[PDB]
Copies of this chain bind each other. A is one copy, B any other.
Amino acid sequence: REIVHLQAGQCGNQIGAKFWEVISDEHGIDPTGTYHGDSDLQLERINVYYNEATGGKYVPRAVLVDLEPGTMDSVRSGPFGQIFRPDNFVFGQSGAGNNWAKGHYTEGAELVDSVLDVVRKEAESCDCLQGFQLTHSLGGGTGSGMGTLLISKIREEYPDRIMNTFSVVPSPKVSDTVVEPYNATLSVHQLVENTDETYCIDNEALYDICFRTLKLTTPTYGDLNHLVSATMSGVTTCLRFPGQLNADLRKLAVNMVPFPRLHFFMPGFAPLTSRGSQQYRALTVPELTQQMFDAKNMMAACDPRHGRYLTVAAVFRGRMSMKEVDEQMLNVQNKNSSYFVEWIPNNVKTAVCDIPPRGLKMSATFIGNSTAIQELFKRISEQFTAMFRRKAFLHWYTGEGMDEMEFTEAESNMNDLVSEYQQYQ
């Protein structure tokens, strides 16, 4: 089993970088390429996210892609930087002024041809290919746009591998770009098109998580990005470490996504305690379920207590008993009866790996398709509606080769989904 990682965009690339460290340490590769680790349960599956390099060296399977050249230098000049291969750092010249357009019809194009060539070598090399993977935002031509292109093109050359975009949905309060509403709407259509499990994360929630559970006094994008790194490291765990109830990326999808169109899920790490309560707490399978469901954790800003929980998953890591997991999972499915659709309740999917996260008796990740995501695709649609009506900052998107109908087809797809969700509440 193997999985490529196409970090496109700044949000994406910087997220990809931190993730590669949280994937290295766990496996044991050092900030160069040598295995200076411990057990064999750390090199028995370095074939998945990693490759091989003459002389006990391990290059990450990645196709770093972004326009503004600066991004790549930052990654290289970062920590685990030289690990990435030089001929996979495919970057561009002129940047895309946060225009979903430029990165899909203008700049992206010239590079997209090349990006797919580097991505080809990576995939063509390995025989099996569980699925691809992409890390992007949803509010700039780099990640939101160029990506949707590097997902469409990829899905049409490889239409059987599990795609998985850990996108960062646009935010409600903590905004940053005024063309963000547009950037996102014109994008969700392409994700709702062909993406197996688009895990949606929201800067807002991640922030609160760092201001109540991590009690951090000042969360810098470093920390905020680390939390998402844990989720990117807790879905592919059953693919690179032993387990008592294995569950790879594909399985998770089949036993999660109900109809082939609800592929927007929310994340959640488990033992995320402040440094002043790790002493007062007792990691026990139970205590790893309250800090697992409690709205706060869910990193998407869509309190599931509003809508219903379509299908819930829990890829618990660590060394726990499954009678305990199974029970402390049923207690939930039962007790909270409304949320889990009462008429057709989705017995939460549970999986248990053994190799835990470096320094943490037990751990777990959470994926829960919830009929509440609506209050996220919806807000981005009210923001589109407003600006679109009085054709707002459209003289830039139209001035790229895009027409106007495209925007209406976009708004249609989004509200089409909003109903496709409400029709299960």
Contact B282 A53 (CB under 8 A): yes
Q: Is A276 an interface residue (CB 8 A)?
A: yes
- In the complex, are the beta carbons of A280 and B57 less than 8 A apart? yes
CB-contact partner of A59 in B33, B280, B286, B296, under 8 A: B280
**Cβ-defined contact, B53 with A280, below 8 A:** yes
Count residues on chain A whose CB falls below 8 Å from chain B CBs: 29
Q: CB distance B86 to A294 under 8 Å?
A: no
Contacts of A294 on B, CB cut-off 8 Å?
Answer: 117, 121
| Among candidates B52, B117, B281, B287, residue contacting A282 with C-beta atoms closer than 8 Å | B52
Contact digits for A332-359, partner B, Cβ 8 Å, 1 yes 0 no: 0001000000000000000000000000
Taking chain A's interface residues, is the majority helix, strand, or loop, or is none over half, making it mixed?
loop
CA distance A86 to B277 in the complex (A): 6
Cβ-based interface call for A279 (8 A): yes
The interface of chain A, by Cβ under 8 A from chain B, is 33, 52-55, 57, 59, 85-87, 117, 121, 124-125, 274, 276-277, 279-283, 286-287, 290-291, 294, 296, 335
User: Can you list 19 pairs linking A and B with CB atoms under 8 Å apart?
Assistant: A33-B280, A53-B279, A53-B280, A53-B281, A54-B281, A54-B282, A85-B277, A85-B281, A86-B274, A86-B276, A86-B277, A86-B280, A117-B294, A117-B296, A121-B290, A121-B291, A124-B335, A125-B286, A125-B290
Q: Contacts A86-B280, A87-B277 given; 11 further ones with Cβ under 8 A? A: A53-B282, A54-B281, A55-B279, A59-B280, A85-B277, A85-B280, A86-B276, A117-B296, A121-B290, A124-B335, A125-B290
